[PDB]
Design a protein around this ligand. Structure first.
Ligand SMILES: O=C(O)CNC(=O)C(=O)O
Ligand SMILES: [Mg+2]
Ligand code: NI
Ligand SMILES: [Zn+2]
Length: 331
């Protein structure tokens, strides 16, 4: 069995190996990368996502989200308060302001300490989930707006044509902006490219141990757990590395820098935070190996998780017994 300790693997594909996306994901898996839940891919030196980032300031962040925490430093939830629209240029200025900028620090480890110690006492503003792409149309390799669609994958594997589309999303971050513990919709893969700016730290639980995390979360968020049998689908709960270590939950951590891709694997729980102003792009995708995960994925039917149009067909086809209850939660 490859990678039996479930360590995060880092890959350095050549320009020739960067041509065929599906084949390279399958290569990574042949080496055990999926066991960690997360892998890093450093593009060949010849590659670029686009020529420059000099002309992105007029992108609109229609609904910036202020991330307000409740709880204790290591065990907290966050809610998202909607703020007035602002441009990327306005957001970048805000991120760099004295109120929101990254504090002085020695290294990534010192910053991580300061995050966990102090996150709850601040409410950073995240420009998340913005439909769009920063890849140049002429970038042919690992262009997240030109991947094979999940609908086409389901059709190729299962023979059923379905409605729906699959497009990327932009995330503009600042110091302490936070992504809560989650897996993807329908336990899909995700791919994330950090276009520019400051790093993003990730934490991940191996897929084979995801239920250990779920059991801890039910213990630590007992009201939430009574409200919904899949409440981590709400994407609101944070648990620190210290707490995870105290409770014996297996996990790993890694920092992504500008110019690097991360891939999350089916049923790989992940969480993290941004170090300062940055812009990432991400999209879900599928492979043949995903289908069995999609068939087994938990679902939120309490009404909170509320998701895209395109998840309908996945539930309808892969989880017909669950469909009626899940759709009630959508409506
Ligand atoms: O970057 C973020 O805020 C969150 N990203 C992911 O959860 C992902 O790419 O799967
Ligand atoms: Mg612009
Ligand atoms: Ni994710
Ligand atoms: Zn729910």
């Amino acid at each position: 069995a490859q990678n039996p300790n479930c360590n995060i693997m880092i890959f350095h594909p050549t320009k020739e190996e960067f041509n065929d996306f599906d084949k390279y994901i399958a290569y990574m898996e042949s080496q055990g990368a999926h066991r960690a839940g997360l892998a890093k891919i450093i593009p060949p030196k010849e590659w670029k996502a686009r020529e420059t980032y000099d002309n992105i300031s007029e992108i609109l962040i229609a609904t910036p989200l202020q991330q307000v925490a409740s709880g204790r430093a290591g065990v907290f939830t966050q809610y998202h308060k909607k703020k007035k629209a602002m441009t990327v240029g306005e957001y970048r200025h805000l991120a760099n302001s004295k109120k929101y900028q990254t504090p002085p620090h020695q290294n990534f480890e010192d910053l991580e300490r300061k995050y966990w110690k102090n996150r709850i006492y601040n409410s950073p503003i995240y420009g998340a989930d913005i439909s769009g792409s920063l890849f140049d149309e002429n970038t042919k390799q690992w262009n997240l707006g030109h991947l094979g669609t999940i609908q086409d994958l389901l059709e190729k594997e299962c023979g059923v044509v379905i409605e729906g589309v699959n497009t990327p999303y932009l995330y503009f971050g600042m110091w302490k902006t936070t992504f809560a513990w989650h897996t993807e919709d329908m336990d899909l893969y995700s791919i994330n490219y950090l276009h520019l700016g400051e790093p993003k730290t990730w934490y991940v639980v191996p897929p084979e141990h995801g239920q250990r995390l779920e059991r801890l979360a039910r213990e630590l968020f007992p009201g939430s757990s009574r409200g919904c049998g899949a409440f981590l689908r709400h994407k609101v709960a944070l648990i620190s590395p210290t707490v995870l270590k105290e409770n014996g939950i297996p996990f790993n951590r890694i920092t992504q820098e500008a110019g690097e891709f991360m891939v999350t694997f089916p049923y790989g729980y992940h969480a993290g935070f941004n170090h300062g102003f940055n812009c990432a792009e991400a999209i879900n995708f599928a492979t043949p190996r995903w289908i069995d995960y999609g068939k087994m994925a938990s679902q939120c039917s309490c009404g909170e998780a509320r998701v895209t149009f395109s998840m309908d067909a996945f539930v309808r086809i892969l989880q017909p017994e669950r469909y009626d209850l899940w759709k009630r939660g959508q409506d």
